[PDB]
């Protein structure tokens, strides 16, 4: 048995109007337009083990002015259904990847490419 | 049943012989009369009107009960003086009579019958309302 553990990072920093209302995570994907893929942590607590592990997932969020560069810390919130999979909007960006803007200012991709 | 012989009520023989004589001749009328007028004994009876026997407890046709007993329907004396089927007409002939005589029926006759007077109304001390 693996039961959802609400007490976590996003719960402790932000008062969530309902379950999972707001979330926080790193901007993994900005390939799609007006849609910054984010990886955030939703906790699962094992009563058997009595230890809780983190299962990280992928959420989409809508950034209007294309403000989210790869490697940023965003504080997203839930909202009305924008598409089949977007229901989040980037409420605020905490940590901007300075390099990501500058490494784009040089003319490159905001992150070196993966290896495999 | 709970108050086996605690009621000081007197028997039917001494009190109401006409009911005692109205009883169906159960051959034990010397015994049936000895019971109280209030008793819950489901005695048989004779149709005063319909020439048949009918089963109505002593107090029902009597209409009398002990203080502490839950009072009966206050108009039972007539309901059980008459054998039940043959009884219906009696209490309906009276009210239908005074019904057509004015074309009016209101069951509220009890209230005006309950009304002894505005003097009797003041037997209630009403409360100092806020």
């Amino acid at each position: 048995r693996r039961m959802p553990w609400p007490y976590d990072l996003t719960s402790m920093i932000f008062n969530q109007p309902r379950q999972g209302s707001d979330k926080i995570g790193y901007v993994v994907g900005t390939s799609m337009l007006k849609t910054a893929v984010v990886a955030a942590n939703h906790m699962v607590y094992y009563p058997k083990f009595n230890q809780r592990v983190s299962r990280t997932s992928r959420f989409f969020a809508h950034d209007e002015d294309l403000a989210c560069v790869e490697g940023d810390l965003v504080h997203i919130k839930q909202s009305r259904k924008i598409s089949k999979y977007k229901h989040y909007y980037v409420f605020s960006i905490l940590e901007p990847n300075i390099e990501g803007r500058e490494r784009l200012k040089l003319g490159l991709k905001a992150v070196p490419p993966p290896l495999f | 049943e709970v108050l086996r012989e605690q009621t000081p009520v007197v028997a039917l023989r001494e009190a109401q012989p006409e009911l005692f004589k109205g009883l169906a001749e159960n051959e034990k009328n010397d015994n049936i009369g000895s019971l109280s007028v209030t008793s819950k004994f489901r005695a048989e009876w004779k149709c005063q009107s319909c020439g048949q026997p009918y089963r109505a407890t002593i107090r029902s046709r009597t209409g009398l009960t002990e203080p502490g007993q839950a009072p009966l329907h206050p108009r039972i004396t007539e309901w059980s003086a008459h054998c039940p089927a043959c009884a219906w007409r009696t209490n309906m002939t009276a009210i239908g009579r005074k019904a057509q005589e004015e074309g009016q029926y209101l069951g509220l006759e009890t209230s005006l019958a309950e009304l002894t007077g505005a003097a009797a109304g003041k037997r209630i001390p009403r409360r100092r309302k806020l």
Binding site: - | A120, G121, R123, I124, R126
Partner: protein, 92 residues
Amino acid sequence: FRDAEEKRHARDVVNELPNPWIDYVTHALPFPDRDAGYPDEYGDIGQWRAPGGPGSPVKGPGYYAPPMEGEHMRGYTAEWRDPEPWERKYKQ
């Protein structure tokens, strides 16, 4: 009907006695007046706890001293401002 039922009501002395089941409603809000033996924060039955323990809402401070730069002598004396035949043993 209404008057002649209220009128006969105006005669009987058994009336004019406030019947609780008619006069009012005991409690209107869905949450009870006080905590009544329900499972506590730690999951134990109310038999194993006493209401008003440490989980009780904080009673709150008494005074009000906003700053660290709270500098006033003749203060700090305004917090405390403390016949009869008592039995000797008990007063001991």
